[PDB]
Ligand binder design. Sequence first.
Ligand code: HEM
Length: 153
Amino acid sequence: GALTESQAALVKSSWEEFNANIPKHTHRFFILVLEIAPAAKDLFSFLKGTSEVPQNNPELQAHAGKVFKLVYEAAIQLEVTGVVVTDATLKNLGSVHVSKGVADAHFPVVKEAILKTIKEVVGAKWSEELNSAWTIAYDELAIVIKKEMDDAA
Ligand code: HEM
């Protein structure tokens, strides 16, 4: 696809839409995760011991917000510059995932959970050209974190 000026404009616009409702989009995102894969629950400190996904847990919200921010920032950086840049933060991210027991086959779980989350977020504006734009940005960012986990292990 690339990342035409016209595609990037379409990711920005759809991220602004996501941030606009963190407690919803973030608890949604954790349920689409547990639907695709239920066992994933024991991994998360704030989900252990619970029977259901807490809806107002600040620990969970702050956690899932930081996740989507990082995908969007990736798309713009691809249209301007042509790439996704690896920094300290992406590296520390790779360590914590490993401590907690996370693996690569967990990633399509979270991608489908994010495309389905953004198709749910943009509704009728959805275009091929947009799906094509977030797919390219997640795929490009996951490539980068998987790379750093492997390195934290
Ligand atoms: C591009 C994709 C991904 C991004 C951008 C991302 C980002 C993050 C961030 C930023 C943190 C730490 C947040 C904090 O300090 O508050 C974190 C923690 C964690 N991540 Fe991910 N993540 C990704 C994929 C995954 C996958 C595929 C899994 C597996 C299900 C996973 C499981 C976890 C767990 C268990 C923790 C620790 C939570 C704790 O017990 O408190 N992540 N992630």
